[PDB]
Design a protein around this nucleic acid. Structure first.
Ligand SMILES: CC[C@H]1OC(=O)[C@H](C)[C@@H](O[C@H]2C[C@@](C)(OC)[C@@H](O)[C@H](C)O2)[C@H](C)[C@@H](O[C@@H]2O[C@H](C)C[C@H](N(C)C)[C@H]2O)[C@](C)(O)C[C@@H](C)C(=O)[C@H](C)[C@@H](O)[C@]1(C)O
Lengths: 55, 118, 7, 122, 209, 114
RNA sequence: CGAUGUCGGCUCAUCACAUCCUGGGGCUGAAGUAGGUCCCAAGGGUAUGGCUGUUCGCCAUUUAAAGUGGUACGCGAGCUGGGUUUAGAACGUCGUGAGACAGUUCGGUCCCUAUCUGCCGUGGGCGCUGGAGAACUGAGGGGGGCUGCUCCUAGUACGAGAGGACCGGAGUGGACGCAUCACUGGUGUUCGGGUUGUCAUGCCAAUGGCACUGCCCGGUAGCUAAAUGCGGAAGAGAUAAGUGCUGAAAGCAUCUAAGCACGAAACUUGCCCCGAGAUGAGUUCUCCCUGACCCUUUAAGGGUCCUGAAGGAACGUUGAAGACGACGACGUUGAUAGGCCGGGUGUGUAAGCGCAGCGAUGCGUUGAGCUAACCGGUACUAAUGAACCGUGAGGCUUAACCU
RNA sequence: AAUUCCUUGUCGGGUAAGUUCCGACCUGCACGAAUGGCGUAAUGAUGGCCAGGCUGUCUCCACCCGAGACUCAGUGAAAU
RNA sequence: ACACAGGUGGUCAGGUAGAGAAUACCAAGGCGCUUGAGAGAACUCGGGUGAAGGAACUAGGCAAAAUGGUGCCGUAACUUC
RNA sequence: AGGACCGAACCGACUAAUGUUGAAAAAUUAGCGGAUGACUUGUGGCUGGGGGUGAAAGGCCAAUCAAACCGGGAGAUAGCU
């Protein structure tokens, strides 16, 4: 259950080496408006692939 | 180990799942576009599309089956009167999912599910 | 309770 | 699927009405007995006028199982109630004369041919 | 001789006229075209490489496009090798159908078995479940003890534990061929071969004769 | 599938009389005892039918001399030579395992007269 | 002694060989069968129950056999807690007594979320000297290796007779393992039906909610065993005990010193699986890059602009792939998923209407209606044009050749 | 024998097989008559033993339904 | 010690089925218990079903399964009747 | 009638499982016992530390009992760590 002695700050950083959050590669541009959005998502202004979907 | 098994459990039991799908089908037929989560939207596709296919023939027995699967007479009225003659041409695919970001509270994947008329 | 005890 | 402690009925008229399997003979760690399989039994209930008494440890052969035997055709014949024919402890020959009810054609071999030439159905 | 690459198409049974029913696995053995032939001049060992099936022309990369278009063949899914045991010579592009298995009597089928996922020790290694009652506390299908004490002081390598079950290469040997269809390019073998329906199988003649 | 269904429909027997459960049916089956082959009657109650194409089966329950016997016949097996429906019974289930729980007067069932 | 938790049982083992079985031999007071005894051999195997807290033991019944030990009398951060050994109470006995008793009896809280090593799995990074996509050789590592019975030879060899083979050859089982659901079954709270109580949909009729899925009856696909296929090998090498051939030392003799041949489930291969991080980083095939300049510590140097290639990743639809990564299919030049259509399966003759009945209900329409995960099709819906990473012919030395 | 060491006394019953149980015999190590002896109907969340029914206790596990465990976002300990 | 599955005296007590203040479903009325979203591995918890067998489990039938209501019929030894 | 019987409230705590850095410093869940009495409960009193009270376990006396707590002798004493 408990440790026999405490780990180092080195073994702590090596453990946290795999915790880096991936960035989004690039946001895509809509054809009509030009606003950035995620792929396969609608924009904030409700456009998807050049079509006004939500009011 | 889930090999070729359909249906999502959605962290509910069977009665809660069935009642939740009945409520969501009522809200979708009522408002014609609803915001929900993504897997609930896919399961809602598999629930609400047979009701629209049931509305394609208007009889007493089919309206009673639609009442048995929606329990709202205003919903079965709107189905058999509006969504029947409107969706008469297209064969399947009466609905459309569109992803809309993430929820602010629980970071849940959002979606709009709507009918193909608007 | 003399089960873990070396008695 | 007769294992030990299974209570079988008796197919012939040796005197017992109910026997119990105490050992499935043949092979180390053997679990079950089908139709072709000798079992060692003890006698739990006998008629008062019979050839064998209660508490006799002898051998028997299963003739009917509720699990049922499978034919090479894909078929399966499942009886109702488990049954055995009692045998001589060393001679391997049956004790009673008449044999009640059906048996299987799986049983067809020399000593059980002596058995099977007595049964009404096969 | 060499094996052929086919696809597992379900299971059924055939009825021999004697009365016996035998379960067969149906293996669709398409035309196997030889792409590249290895010989011990360049490679040190002699072999053939075959492909079968078909792929999309937009799903083929230019390395494998050039490798298929180098010698006479068309694009199939996958490439496999066969080791040419002493006395077979094959031109590239040679179509190899199921007549060699029309001659043969026993066969070995190799496939990737169905993946059972992370399984426990009871499912993977046929461990005996402990007591369900009589006092037991949270330890019904747990693996028991895994080692002795201070004297090893460590678990031994190859100790049977839980983990990935399924999804691995399995060979089944000495399966009898019951029928060979050349107009349907089918292969009926007796019994059960590893994989799901539609999985790619390798069919070699039997070695343990 | 397309290949499995094809192989099985060329395996399937052409003429088999359609019956429903509850029908008293007598099956004549082939029986081999070495050199000589024989035909053997098994008359009982059809209690279960499993329609699967070539893999169809039907279970028949018959009370022999003191005992209850149940035989599952593969329909398109070659050892089944003839199936003849002798009495048509009018149960309303598709399976009749309560006849396994019953005996005597309780195990009789009404005739159809469709 | 500022704590190293006991006996027995369960689960999981692992090694030694002083071998219980199987295997190989020598001698026998070895006719055969079956033994005894000794040598070689550790590959595999090596019961179930009754009694007892028991290890042990006795007993019953099998088996080819029911090995003997080590591993904190293996194994409680894996389980149990019957026994001993807390506090209660009693018996016999001892003691004036409080009380005591390897004497008995009834009752009596078993904590831990794993940091490191280890082990089972599964990934990311970088390397492998231009990058990429594949297919392999395989150094090495692991798994597996059990055996009965019946028949033939042959009732022959052997033996007065009773009995009864070696060697060899098939068949058929038991335990064990791997695989897969075609069969036979289980499950199937996502399918159909019955039914009880109550509430609601205005009511009737019809349905729905809740009562453990209310209780049940069947049952699709998946998963699965008790279901069904397969396996253990043959052969090869080198041998152990043992048996030899030729042969001196030692005119003989001698399996041995020279030389030669046999000889076991052990060893190395043969079968199966992993495997080039095998840093000794391998081989083969295919594909992709063919631009200009300046600076300085003119170095396997830095920088700027122009080009971003093969491919990859990301995203999306997903999968008999999966904890997550990964792996696989597809992304409209499209059957990847849902829907839809047709079928199949399952359940059992829907509702409504009409007839018979006083009625419950029965009959006709009607093998109807409904059908999950299945099958074959169909772009109806969702898989967006892109952007992002990855470059611009890839060092030195020596050899062999080509112009 | 809630008492018995030797001891699983010996015989009987029950079991295929019974160190426990039941009935006996007395060799009472070390019962015994109000620190009561021997019975005893009824009672007991009382101790032991046997039987019928019943069953996943077990042979030997399999599948399903939910709650965690697993991933994502928010908050965020502890023994050592 | 906590916005803590505990504890805390009295009064009122509707409908249907029910002997009932049990129990099931409801009315008046009040709540959905102050982290959610997915996925659908091992293992753990709480349940459901299970072929053949039926205590072989185990210290011990522990735990489960079974039994279960009303009316009538019938009911042994023993007994302090 | 009954320290009668079955069985809710109420009182208790026999078995199992879970919890054991708990939801809880003694619980929950599923069964379990008594339930007109030697019953249970509210409010208020009385008994006190070698003392009380005890259908008796050395049990209980404010999460403390083979002599409560608080404060003072007091920096008791410690051949011991
Ligand atoms: C709820 C959780 C509680 O622990 C338990 O109940 C377990 C189950 C006890 O075993 C209980 C129950 C039991 C039978 O042991 C299982 C009994 O023998 C002991 C005396 O008490 C433990 C572990 C005992 O240790 C043991 O003490 C022995 C004297 C020596 C032994 N050592 C040699 C290894 C050691 O581990 C002991 C003393 O209580 C530990 C001390 C630290 C505690 O008091 C702590 C606070 C515990 O009460 C606890 C953690 O809250």
């Amino acid at each position: 259950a408990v440790q026999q002695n405490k780990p180092t700050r080195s073994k702590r950083g090596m453990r946290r080496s795999h915790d880096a959050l991936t960035a989004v590669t690039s946001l895509s541009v809509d054809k009509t408006s030009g606003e950035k959005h995620l792929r396969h998502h609608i924009t904030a202004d409700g456009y998807y692939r050049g079509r006004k979907v939500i009011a | 180990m889930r090999h070729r098994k359909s249906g999502r459990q959605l962290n509910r039991n069977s009665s809660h799942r069935q009642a939740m799908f009945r409520n969501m089908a009522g809200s979708l037929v009522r408002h014609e576009i609803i915001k929900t989560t993504l897997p609930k939207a896919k399961e809602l596709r598999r629930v609400v599309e047979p009701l629209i296919t049931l509305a394609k023939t208007d009889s007493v027995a089919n309206r009673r089956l639609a009442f048995a699967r929606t329990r709202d007479n205003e919903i079965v009225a709107k189905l058999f009167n509006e969504l029947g003659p409107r969706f008469a041409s297209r064969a399947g695919g009466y609905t459309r999912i569109l992803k809309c970001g993430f929820r602010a509270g629980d970071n849940a994947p959002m979606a709009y599910i709507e009918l193909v008329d608007r | 309770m003399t089960h873990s005890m070396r008695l | 699927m007769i294992q030990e402690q299974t209570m079988l009925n008796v197919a012939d008229n040796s005197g017992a009405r109910r026997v119990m399997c105490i050992k499935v003979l043949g092979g180390s760690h053997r679990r079950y007995a089908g139709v072709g399989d000798i079992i060692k039994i003890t006698i739990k209930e006998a008629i008062p006028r019979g050839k064998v008494k209660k508490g006799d440890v002898l051998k028997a052969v299963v003739v009917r199982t509720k699990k049922g035997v499978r034919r090479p055709d894909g078929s399966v014949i499942r009886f109702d109630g488990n049954a055995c024919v009692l045998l001589n402890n060393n001679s391997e020959q049956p004790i009673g004369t008449r044999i009640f009810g059906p048996v299987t054609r799986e049983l067809r071999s020399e000593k059980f041919m002596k058995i099977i030439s007595l049964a009404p159905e096969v | 001789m060499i094996g052929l690459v086919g696809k597992k198409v379900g299971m059924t049974r055939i009825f021999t006229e004697d009365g016996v029913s035998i379960p067969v696995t149906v293996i669709e053995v398409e035309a196997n075209r030889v792409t590249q032939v290895k010989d011990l001049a360049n490679d040190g060992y002699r072999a053939i490489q075959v492909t079968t099936g078909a792929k999309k022309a937009n799903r083929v990369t230019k390395p494998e496009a050039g490798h298929f278009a180098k010698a006479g063949v068309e694009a199939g899914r996958g490439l496999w090798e066969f080791r040419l045991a002493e006395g077979e010579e094959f031109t590239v592009g040679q179509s190899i159908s199921v007549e060699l298995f029309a001659d043969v009597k026993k066969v070995d089928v190799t496939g990737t078995s169905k993946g059972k996922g992370f399984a426990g020790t009871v499912k993977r290694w046929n461990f005996r479940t402990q007591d369900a009652t009589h006092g037991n506390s949270l330890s019904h299908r747990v693996p028991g003890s895994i080692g002795q004490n201070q004297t090893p002081g460590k678990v031994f390598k190859g100790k049977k534990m839980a983990g990935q079950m399924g999804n691995e290469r399995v060979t089944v040997q000495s399966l009898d061929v019951v029928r060979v269809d050349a107009e349907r390019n089918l292969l009926l073998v007796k019994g059960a071969v590893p994989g799901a329906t539609g999985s790619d199988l390798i069919v070699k003649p039997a070695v343990k004769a | 599938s397309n290949i499995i269904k094809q192989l099985e429909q060329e395996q399937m027997k052409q003429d088999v009389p359609s019956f429903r459960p509850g029908d008293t049916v007598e099956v004549k089956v082939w029986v081999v005892e070495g050199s000589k082959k024989r035909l053997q009657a098994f008359e009982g109650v059809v209690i279960a039918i499993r329609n699967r194409g070539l893999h169809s089966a039907f279970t028949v329950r018959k009370i022999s001399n003191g005992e209850g016997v149940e035989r599952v016949f593969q329909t398109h097996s070659p050892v089944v030579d003839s199936i003849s429906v002798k009495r048509r019974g009018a149960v309303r289930k598709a399976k009749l395992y309560y006849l396994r729980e019953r005996t005597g007067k309780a195990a009789r069932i009404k005739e159809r007269l469709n």
